[PDB]
Amino acid sequence: TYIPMSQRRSWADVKPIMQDDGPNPVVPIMYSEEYKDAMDYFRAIAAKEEKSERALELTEIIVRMNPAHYTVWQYRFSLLTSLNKSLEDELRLMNEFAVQNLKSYQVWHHRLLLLDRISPQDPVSEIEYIHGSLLPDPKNYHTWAYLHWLYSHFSTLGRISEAQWGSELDWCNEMLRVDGRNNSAWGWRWYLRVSRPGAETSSRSLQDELIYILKSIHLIPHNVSAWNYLRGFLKHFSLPLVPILPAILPYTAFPMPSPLPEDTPLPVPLALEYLADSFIEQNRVDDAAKVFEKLSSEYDQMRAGYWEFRRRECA
Amino acid sequence: ATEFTPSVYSLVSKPLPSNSRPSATLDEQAETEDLISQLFDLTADPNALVSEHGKRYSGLRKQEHTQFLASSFFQLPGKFVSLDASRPWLVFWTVHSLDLLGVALDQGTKDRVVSTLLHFLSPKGGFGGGPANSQIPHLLPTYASVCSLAIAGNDSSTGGWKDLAAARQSIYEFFMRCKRPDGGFVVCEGGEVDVRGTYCLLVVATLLDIITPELLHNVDKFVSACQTYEGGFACASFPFPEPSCRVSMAEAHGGYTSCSLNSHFLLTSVPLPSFPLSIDANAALRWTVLQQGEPIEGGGFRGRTNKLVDGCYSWWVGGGAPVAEELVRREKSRKVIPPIFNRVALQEFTLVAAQQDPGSTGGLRDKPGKRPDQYHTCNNLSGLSIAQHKMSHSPSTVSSNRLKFDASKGLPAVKPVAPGGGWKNEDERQNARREIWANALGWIEEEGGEIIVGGKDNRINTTTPVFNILGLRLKPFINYFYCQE
Ligand SMILES: N#Cc1ccc(Cn2cncc2CN2CCN(c3cccc(Cl)c3)C(=O)C2)cc1
Ligand SMILES: CC(C)=CCC/C(C)=C/CC/C(C)=C/COP(=O)(O)OP(=O)(O)O
Ligand SMILES: OC[C@H]1O[C@@](CO)(O[C@H]2O[C@H](CO)[C@@H](O)[C@H](O)[C@H]2O)[C@@H](O)[C@@H]1O
Ligand SMILES: OC[C@H]1O[C@@](CO)(O[C@H]2O[C@H](CO)[C@@H](O)[C@H](O)[C@H]2O)[C@@H](O)[C@@H]1O
Ligand SMILES: OC[C@H]1O[C@@](CO)(O[C@H]2O[C@H](CO)[C@@H](O)[C@H](O)[C@H]2O)[C@@H](O)[C@@H]1O
Ligand SMILES: O=S(=O)(O)C[C@H](O)CNC1CCCCC1
Ligand SMILES: O=S(=O)(O)C[C@H](O)CNC1CCCCC1
Ligand SMILES: O=S(=O)(O)C[C@H](O)CNC1CCCCC1
Ligand SMILES: [Zn+2]
């Protein structure tokens, strides 16, 4: 049975404050006895701006019931800094939250704030945790965004070694080996290989990247992730499409296509987009328009309107 | 009108090819393809004259959806505590859906909506996810509350619009407290930084006439750098050490692409020099159209590459299409008509797959197998509206707006945080007021552009791109704050 906080001697000095909903509010929630009681006392605690251990304990009670309660999370971090609490211990609690399936924008942001403040000299153990946390949830958007932040923030502090970057690429390669259709991992590859300030982008480095991309395409010809990466790569480095065309041409009917893998019906819509864009590069607008028309009427009819727009843009 | 928008039923439905490489992504995809295609097979083609015998009827069950929204509008069970910090969204999702469904609230109920939301307003500025004595202000419920007040409020003493006008300075100050030097905003004190915050802030600032140069500095650069190699936009960009370079921090997503395109569009009507920093509109358009699913997955939109189709992205991705289209149009005109997405297929996804099965709770949903909710009800319907009605931003309408604008009418100018943070002079401020107001009211329903799949009984009202409220709500609301009534 639940013991009301008004009956607890630890809270006797606190006068709870009721929720100020006003008369007959819309969308009211029938709060549980526990949640209402906790919020009544939090309202009082926060109004008086008490920074104490009981206030800290109370914030944990509330966020367990509602992980998205941003006000309480804001108050919790203020409590951690005011009381000079062990932030490493708090990180361990956040790990437990993930295991207990308690998640939100707020939990991930709280984690960011903790790592920012702890500011470890080597963030390897946190990087390792994040990798492990992606196993049951390989596409969790918050986790991927956090990983980007972690490497970005700590690299500005000069705290990411070349060995650390190397193992990160190794890990990303394994993720893409496990699931080549994981677009989140492709996005992480782009950061590691293209967009990050320290990315190695020499002539031979671009050659190696092209090889990797094409081999990914030849392995999974219908993988939209791989095609978007190819097109993004050539566009970013202002590389002509024509010299790579022999590797893509078989999908419209450097590493070349495999007999093609089984269950690979032709043509691949994005291979046709490539072919059409290569015609535009050659100033062959009529040939380009012909491909867009085929995409519109036969090979990618869902986007009939869009491909017609691209066709008209040639004429 | 439908030449380039083939019906799902007129196309061949085949699974996404495996290329003989199985993966977790494909396992989920094939399973979802099965769920959606099987429901399409059980449902009568909405376009057919002879609605075949024994098959489920796909008509929009407006009354079921009205009952769904009504049954949770006045009381929510204890489990909804997960959305206690999102109660203004529960308000917005309901009142906007009812607007779209053409269901009027009586004045008494409207007054309750106003009262509920006004108690969420802090004197220091901004709305929170609950009462001011319970929750701190936050950019997202500020958007949700402001839009809800546009929908349910009025210009009388009990209508709430008066309260917003008085709160203009404090709301502006809250916005400035959220501002970071790189152009990002925290969603709340000590909160996360992403383009949802930027979008929600820019909508409210536009509507209430509280835009200044200091509020917008670097905001364009932050958003522009969210664009990924895929063409869509990520949650945020990281400023590398004024900054040497800005880098996108995750995948292009429908939600963040919606917020980014809309944010950028709002910024284009602010006449600051070399502002806003350009985005790649064609890449954004390409990404948008590529997220429309194949016939087997019902022509609904997915939120990101190699993920699943979901009814809510009809608004987030579909509703970004007319914005991207307009930006592409402007760019081609700067250097120097068929629909750009399958408007028919999207309506078919909504009618066939996104509605709750008949004779039950009602409401609209993510996909078959998922419980309907308020969030999906609102976003399915908002997306359906975009598909049904051809919305365009009209330069001639904007020109007509400019001609009727009265600069001598307006509320007191906000006092900037920094002495030089305001407009250079009154002429430049008034020119900005005119541009912001004229462009905000530039969206028109194209004559002859209407396509209502399944017949006119399926027609819902026309939402406005960028803002996502009805034009009939937007006009008197913005006119009130700019004193253009
Ligand atoms: N924000 C956000 C968000 C995050 C993830 C998603 C992904 N998504 C897609 N379909 C369902 C979802 C899960 N969403 C439901 C709505 N929602 C929410 C709550 C309060 C307000 C708003 Cl607008 C939205 C969430 O936070 C989580 C969608 C939206
Ligand atoms: C104005 C405002 C508040 C806009 C928000 C827009 C929006 C829909 C954002 C989604 C953000 C996000 C982390 C999605 C991933 O969720 P998921 O992995 O559950 O969904 P997924 O599989 O479709 O990507
Ligand atoms: O977290 C408490 C801590 O934050 C501050 C500002 O840094 O106040 C914020 O939190 C209070 C409790 O929720 C609110 O009343 C206030 O509006 C908000 O700014 C500090 O004053 C407080 O110690
Ligand atoms: O078999 C491929 C061939 O069929 C078409 C339609 O005639 O596309 C169908 O099959 C594709 C899978 O290979 C699906 O992606 C698509 O949704 C479906 O219509 C042609 O477009 C394609 O060339
Ligand atoms: O399509 C234009 C216009 O025609 C109407 C009837 O006036 O519906 C017809 O067209 C729809 C879309 O092509 C079909 O789904 C429907 O079966 C057919 O009657 C209007 O609803 C529509 O706006
Ligand atoms: O929301 S809708 O599906 O459009 C409308 C509801 O199904 C109501 N259907 C009634 C059943 C009994 C006879 C009168 C009609
Ligand atoms: O000064 S104002 O902002 O107008 C009014 C107070 O600050 C409100 N503080 C609340 C205390 C309880 C938790 C949520 C915040
Ligand atoms: O206005 S039109 O599009 O020509 C035709 C009507 O909208 C058809 N609506 C149906 C009426 C009978 C019950 C099921 C809906
Ligand atoms: Zn959804």
XYZ file of C-alpha atoms in Angstrom, chain A:
315
model
C 0.000 0.000 0.000
C 1.190 3.504 -0.926
C 2.082 5.888 1.914
C 1.042 9.488 1.103
C 3.859 12.047 1.381
C 1.664 14.091 3.755
C 1.968 11.192 6.227
C 5.771 10.980 5.914
C 7.812 12.725 8.625
C 10.573 13.525 6.103
C 8.110 15.737 4.191
C 6.114 17.209 7.117
C 7.635 20.684 6.637
C 6.488 20.843 2.987
C 3.070 22.177 1.998
C 2.066 20.607 -1.354
C 0.838 22.811 -4.217
C -2.080 21.644 -6.386
C -2.020 21.700 -10.195
C -3.332 25.055 -11.448
C -5.509 23.716 -14.290
C -8.205 26.376 -13.964
C -11.929 25.586 -14.283
C -13.052 22.510 -16.272
C -9.857 21.883 -18.300
C -9.823 19.905 -21.548
C -7.703 16.736 -21.997
C -7.272 16.128 -18.254
C -5.360 12.989 -17.269
C -6.668 10.844 -14.410
C -3.287 10.831 -12.641
C -2.504 7.867 -10.401
C -2.400 8.558 -6.656
C 1.406 8.223 -6.768
C 1.953 10.624 -9.697
C -0.407 13.327 -8.384
C 1.188 13.180 -4.925
C 4.719 13.366 -6.375
C 3.790 16.334 -8.599
C 2.034 18.138 -5.721
C 5.284 17.990 -3.754
C 7.516 18.746 -6.751
C 5.465 21.905 -7.383
C 6.242 22.981 -3.807
C 9.914 21.946 -4.026
C 10.497 23.741 -7.351
C 8.626 26.915 -6.332
C 10.860 27.306 -3.253
C 13.876 26.194 -5.354
C 15.021 23.624 -2.786
C 18.248 21.843 -3.746
C 18.386 18.752 -1.545
C 18.727 14.955 -1.536
C 14.969 14.489 -0.994
C 14.335 16.728 -4.019
C 16.768 14.598 -6.042
C 15.027 11.379 -4.944
C 11.661 12.919 -5.873
C 12.777 13.815 -9.425
C 13.792 10.184 -9.992
C 10.357 9.013 -8.784
C 8.658 11.334 -11.309
C 10.844 10.621 -14.379
C 10.381 6.866 -13.853
C 6.619 7.434 -14.178
C 7.067 9.987 -16.983
C 10.461 9.896 -18.820
C 9.329 12.806 -21.034
C 8.761 15.294 -18.178
C 11.257 17.942 -19.354
C 10.635 20.313 -16.404
C 11.611 17.611 -13.903
C 14.699 16.633 -15.939
C 15.798 20.289 -15.986
C 15.367 20.367 -12.202
C 17.248 17.068 -11.799
C 20.344 18.375 -13.605
C 20.263 21.547 -11.462
C 20.185 19.262 -8.416
C 23.159 17.203 -9.646
C 25.294 20.341 -10.072
C 24.112 22.086 -6.861
C 24.699 19.022 -4.672
C 27.989 18.176 -6.451
C 26.670 14.666 -7.141
C 28.739 11.947 -8.801
C 27.966 12.338 -12.500
C 29.525 8.924 -13.201
C 26.924 7.362 -10.875
C 24.203 9.282 -12.734
C 25.495 7.874 -16.052
C 25.132 4.370 -14.595
C 21.526 5.203 -13.660
C 20.932 6.351 -17.261
C 22.264 2.987 -18.475
C 19.720 1.314 -16.165
C 16.969 3.550 -17.613
C 17.700 2.180 -21.111
C 17.581 -1.414 -19.783
C 14.280 -0.637 -18.018
C 12.936 0.708 -21.350
C 12.677 4.292 -20.056
C 13.540 6.561 -22.988
C 12.894 10.011 -24.516
C 14.520 13.111 -26.032
C 15.055 14.151 -22.397
C 17.031 11.065 -21.324
C 19.337 11.393 -24.347
C 19.805 15.116 -23.746
C 20.489 14.465 -20.044
C 23.185 12.007 -21.162
C 24.699 14.694 -23.430
C 24.761 17.197 -20.548
C 26.461 14.639 -18.277
C 29.216 13.836 -20.802
C 29.706 17.529 -21.519
C 30.213 18.228 -17.796
C 32.229 15.093 -16.919
C 34.350 15.920 -19.983
C 36.487 12.745 -19.880
C 39.985 12.903 -21.392
C 39.216 9.737 -23.377
C 35.542 9.065 -24.240
C 36.221 5.487 -25.481
C 34.114 3.741 -22.793
C 31.110 5.939 -23.623
C 31.632 5.241 -27.347
C 31.707 1.516 -26.497
C 28.477 1.769 -24.493
C 26.745 3.538 -27.403
C 27.828 0.827 -29.864
C 26.409 -1.864 -27.550
C 23.143 0.036 -27.036
C 22.560 -0.006 -30.811
C 22.392 -3.837 -30.927
C 18.703 -4.267 -30.005
C 17.844 -1.035 -31.845
C 20.221 -0.503 -34.830
C 18.359 2.525 -36.244
C 17.425 4.474 -33.088
C 17.594 8.062 -34.335
C 18.475 9.646 -30.970
C 21.377 7.227 -30.456
C 22.859 7.959 -33.896
C 22.523 11.734 -33.372
C 24.165 11.400 -29.948
C 27.082 9.429 -31.447
C 27.578 12.238 -33.992
C 27.605 14.780 -31.143
C 30.002 12.724 -28.996
C 32.638 12.423 -31.729
C 32.085 16.032 -32.868
C 32.290 17.600 -29.391
C 35.306 15.592 -28.237
C 37.180 16.020 -31.528
C 37.053 19.829 -31.102
C 38.806 19.198 -27.773
C 41.476 17.220 -29.670
C 40.543 14.066 -27.751
C 39.858 11.633 -30.623
C 43.005 9.836 -31.803
C 43.597 8.440 -35.300
C 43.391 4.914 -33.836
C 39.975 5.856 -32.383
C 38.799 7.087 -35.813
C 40.150 3.861 -37.353
C 38.232 1.564 -34.993
C 35.099 3.662 -35.538
C 35.296 3.041 -39.296
C 35.918 -0.661 -38.579
C 32.775 -0.712 -36.422
C 30.738 1.138 -39.074
C 31.892 -1.352 -41.735
C 30.703 -4.242 -39.552
C 27.293 -2.583 -39.053
C 26.953 -2.284 -42.840
C 28.086 -5.903 -43.245
C 25.389 -7.053 -40.782
C 22.721 -4.971 -42.591
C 23.605 -3.127 -45.814
C 20.152 -1.538 -45.807
C 20.822 0.254 -42.499
C 20.611 3.867 -43.690
C 21.713 5.118 -40.251
C 25.045 3.316 -40.659
C 25.462 4.745 -44.183
C 24.909 8.205 -42.655
C 27.595 7.479 -40.065
C 29.946 6.386 -42.859
C 29.362 9.735 -44.581
C 30.436 11.539 -41.391
C 33.538 9.356 -40.971
C 34.642 9.440 -44.617
C 33.353 12.755 -46.017
C 31.866 15.436 -43.742
C 33.968 15.434 -40.548
C 36.773 18.067 -40.485
C 39.514 15.411 -40.191
C 38.217 13.167 -42.997
C 40.913 11.941 -45.381
C 39.804 13.082 -48.844
C 42.841 12.627 -51.114
C 42.593 11.310 -54.704
C 43.320 7.681 -53.720
C 40.977 8.029 -50.730
C 38.129 8.989 -53.096
C 39.083 6.035 -55.317
C 38.791 3.631 -52.365
C 35.429 5.136 -51.382
C 34.039 4.690 -54.912
C 35.158 1.037 -54.863
C 33.378 0.483 -51.528
C 30.164 2.140 -52.798
C 30.019 0.181 -56.076
C 30.736 -3.141 -54.316
C 27.839 -2.329 -51.974
C 25.625 -1.656 -55.008
C 26.699 -4.905 -56.727
C 25.900 -6.826 -53.531
C 22.427 -5.255 -53.151
C 21.390 -3.585 -56.481
C 17.975 -2.450 -55.162
C 19.453 -0.841 -52.014
C 18.245 2.784 -52.093
C 20.727 3.662 -49.303
C 23.681 2.674 -51.517
C 22.405 4.650 -54.533
C 21.738 7.811 -52.476
C 25.276 7.561 -51.069
C 26.785 7.175 -54.569
C 24.874 10.170 -55.937
C 25.659 12.227 -52.821
C 29.353 11.322 -53.089
C 29.788 12.261 -56.768
C 27.838 15.500 -56.272
C 29.836 16.599 -53.198
C 33.222 16.034 -54.872
C 32.047 17.313 -58.298
C 32.873 13.992 -59.982
C 31.538 13.180 -63.492
C 28.999 10.341 -63.746
C 30.084 9.131 -67.209
C 33.393 7.410 -66.252
C 31.552 5.233 -63.696
C 28.638 4.486 -66.095
C 29.963 1.038 -67.201
C 29.432 -0.198 -63.610
C 25.797 1.012 -63.516
C 24.719 0.333 -67.123
C 23.834 -3.376 -66.546
C 21.121 -2.283 -64.068
C 19.382 -0.167 -66.743
C 18.758 -3.078 -69.140
C 36.197 -0.142 -60.849
C 34.042 -3.070 -59.600
C 31.534 -4.479 -62.102
C 28.214 -6.310 -61.483
C 28.400 -10.039 -60.661
C 25.614 -13.328 -63.606
C 23.494 -10.962 -61.479
C 22.283 -12.126 -58.034
C 18.955 -13.989 -57.953
C 15.811 -11.913 -57.311
C 17.142 -8.812 -59.094
C 14.454 -7.668 -61.578
C 15.565 -5.027 -64.083
C 15.734 -2.123 -64.546
C 16.578 -0.585 -61.157
C 14.780 2.811 -61.006
C 17.754 4.665 -59.487
C 20.093 3.154 -62.096
C 17.852 4.801 -64.700
C 18.049 8.104 -62.790
C 21.845 7.725 -62.977
C 21.680 7.004 -66.729
C 19.396 9.998 -67.336
C 21.606 12.335 -65.273
C 24.682 11.086 -67.166
C 22.944 12.051 -70.444
C 22.375 15.593 -69.083
C 26.087 15.720 -68.185
C 26.817 14.914 -71.855
C 24.414 17.707 -72.948
C 22.178 15.020 -74.494
C 18.838 16.432 -73.304
C 16.647 14.374 -75.674
C 18.161 11.057 -74.530
C 17.737 12.163 -70.907
C 14.065 13.058 -71.483
C 13.477 9.592 -72.996
C 14.715 7.877 -69.808
C 12.624 10.130 -67.531
C 9.563 9.361 -69.670
C 10.200 5.608 -69.287
C 10.572 6.012 -65.515
C 7.294 7.967 -65.479
C 5.248 5.603 -67.661
C 6.804 2.156 -67.082
C 9.611 1.679 -64.557
C 8.763 3.889 -61.534
C 5.102 4.809 -62.014
C 4.457 5.834 -58.388
C 6.585 8.916 -59.176
C 4.951 9.407 -62.616
C 4.445 13.126 -61.929
C 7.971 13.766 -60.652
C 9.680 12.010 -63.582
C 7.429 13.904 -66.020
C 8.626 17.124 -64.338
C 12.252 15.994 -64.867
C 11.389 15.080 -68.478
C 9.863 18.534 -69.137
C 12.930 20.168 -67.560
C 15.028 18.690 -70.398
C 12.717 20.031 -73.128
